[PDB]
Amino acid sequence: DIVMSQSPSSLAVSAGEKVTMSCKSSQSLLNSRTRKNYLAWYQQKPGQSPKLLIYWASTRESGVPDRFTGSGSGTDFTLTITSVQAEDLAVYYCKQSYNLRTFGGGTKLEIKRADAAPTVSIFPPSSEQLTSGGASVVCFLNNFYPKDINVKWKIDGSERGVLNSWTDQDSKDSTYSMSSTLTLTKDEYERHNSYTCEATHKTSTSPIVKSFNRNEC
Amino acid sequence: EVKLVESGGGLVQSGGSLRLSCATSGFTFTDYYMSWVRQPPGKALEWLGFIRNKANGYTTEYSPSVKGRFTISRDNSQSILYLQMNTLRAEDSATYYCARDHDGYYERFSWGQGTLVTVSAAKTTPPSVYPLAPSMVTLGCLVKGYFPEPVTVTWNSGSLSSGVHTFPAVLQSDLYTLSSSVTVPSSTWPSETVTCNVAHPASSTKVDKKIVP
Numbered sequence: 001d002i003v004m005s006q007s008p009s010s011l012a013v014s015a016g017e018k019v020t021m022s023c024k025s026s027q028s029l030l031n032s033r034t035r036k037n038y039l040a041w042y043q044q045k046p047g048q049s050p051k052l053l054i055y056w057a058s059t060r061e062s063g064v065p066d067r068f069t070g071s072g073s074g075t076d077f078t079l080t081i082t083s084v085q086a087e088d089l090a091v092y093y094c095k096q097s098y099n100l101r102t103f104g105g106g107t108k109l110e111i112k113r114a115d116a117a118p119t120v121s122i123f124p125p126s127s128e129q130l131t132s133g134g135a136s137v138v139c140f141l142n143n144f145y146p147k148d149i150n151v152k153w154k155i156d157g158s159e160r161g162v163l164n165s166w167t168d169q170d171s172k173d174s175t176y177s178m179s180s181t182l183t184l185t186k187d188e189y190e191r192h193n194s195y196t197c198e199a200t201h202k203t204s205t206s207p208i209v210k211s212f213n214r215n216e217c
Numbered sequence: 218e219v220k221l222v223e224s225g226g227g228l229v230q231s232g233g234s235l236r237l238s239c240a241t242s243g244f245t246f247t248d249y250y251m252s253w254v255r256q257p258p259g260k261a262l263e264w265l266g267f268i269r270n271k272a273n274g275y276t277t278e279y280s281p282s283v284k285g286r287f288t289i290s291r292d293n294s295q296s297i298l299y300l301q302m303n304t305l306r307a308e309d310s311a312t313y314y315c316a317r318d319h320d321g322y323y324e325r326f327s328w329g330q331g332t333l334v335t336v337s338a339a340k341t342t343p344p345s346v347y348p349l350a351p352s353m354v355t356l357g358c359l360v361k362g363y364f365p366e367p368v369t370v371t372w373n374s375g376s377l378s379s380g381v382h383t384f385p386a387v388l389q390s391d392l393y394t395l396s397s398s399v400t401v402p403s404s405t406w407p408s409e410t411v412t413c414n415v416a417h418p419a420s421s422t423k424v425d426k427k428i429v430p
């Protein structure tokens with residue numbers, strides 16, 4: 001059968017630098033008659049459909065920036081991006097069309113940038129939730145880098161139903177954002193006063209602390 | 218302008234069947250092979266099959282992964298591509314894309330937006346949508362307790378997109394929850410309105426939630 005493999009699985013590169021990724025076929029994709037390699041590259045940005053970049057191994061599709069170059073032949077192919085830009089964040093797939101079609105497993109490209117501290121914001125439960133018996137407290141930690149971050153919830157000063165979610169990297173500023181949601185019953189919510197989101201990130205030895213008090217709502 | 222638009226995705230039980238459609242325009246449909254490709258959440262693209270062009274008698278081919286179980290067809294009067302899926306299983310849960318394929322010369326797929334299929338026994342549950350209200354100021358919406366995916370979130374009907382972060386849904390106790398934040402100048406809110414628009418196609422839910430101070 002035709003097995004397609006890609007390397008690396010993932011990597012991060014700073015804007016302005018060169019990116020090299022590889023694609024191997026278990027069988028030559030060079031058609032004898034047309035003398036072309038039936039190997040294409042697709043770019044899939046976060047939340048989007050794949051987009052054609054390169055086909056016939058080295059032919060760059062119209063509209064695709066010149067910084068993308070496909071090369072290689074037979075069983076081994078390379079996609080090179082020179083002067084990488086923030087918007088190039090994506091998973092890149094190669095695909096053979098020599099015998100039906102088969103995709104490789106993709107290479108995830110992340111963008112490296114300068115460390116950036118998160119902007120933290122905390123939100124009390126809405127009255128429209130409380131009326132149904134639930135109480136979710138939300139903290140947004142926005143536009144930081146790198147991705148690793150710690151969130152602690154404290155209630156009346158004591159550390160404690162938590163839902164965390166990170167965005168994909170931003171295509172413009174190459175930061176991450178995360179949401180942390182603490183969900184309590186209304187009955188338990190009403191037993192305590194201070195609700196505190198504490199974010200610790202390598203950008204400071206001081207946690208960023210955001211809080212609200214129930215009595216102040 | 219070429220357009221490919223999938224439809225038909227949604228929730229279906231194991232063992233059941235579902236048929237997807239792909240409406241096309243902007244090119245001579247019968248000249249082209251058409252492929253279907255799927256992608257499970259967080260995983261790689263998988264080519265499923267194609268149907269050839271008129272010159273090749275509109276014949277079909279399939280990946281071994283779905284041959285015998287999936288069928289491709291096309292309506293050449295209206296330029297619509299179809300994928301019939303039978304005996305569905307959890308592993309078929311994925312975003313399904315149609316793609317324009319070979320024209321007899323070029324080797325390339327020159328794609329739709331995709332339609333999400335979820336194979337599960339769980340019931341459809343509409344979201345609860347809650348406002349998140351407190352230089353620059355950050356507001357949000359909490360879209361809680363829905364099934365299946367997806368939901369869409371916009372802010373002021375699309376007019377706010379910069380400064381928007383929509384957090385991927387996470388499944389806890391058989392329901393999804395997601396949130397979205399929007400950051401705007403404090404001079405503009407609450408002076409001006411800010412509203413999150415949330416849709417959950419599986420339950421035909423449409424919600425506009427104004428962020429009130």
Ligand SMILES: C=CCO[C@]1(C(=O)O)C[C@@H](O[C@]2(C(=O)O)C[C@@H](O)[C@@H](O)[C@@H]([C@H](O)CO)O2)C=C([C@H](O)CO)O1
Nearest residue numbers: 031038097098099100101269272273278319321323324
């Ligand atoms: C199907 C039998 C012969 O098919 C070819 C041939 O000359 O071998 C090629 C074929 O094109 C495909 C195909 O299977 O339909 C699609 C194409 O994208 C590419 O995969 C080639 C494959 O590389 C083989 O060359 O196969 C089309 C036919 C012609 O339409 C008429 O026979 O020829």
Ligand SMILES: [Zn+2]
Nearest residue numbers: 143170380382
């Ligand atoms: Zn941002």
Ligand SMILES: [Zn+2]
Nearest residue numbers: 188189191192
């Ligand atoms: Zn308590």
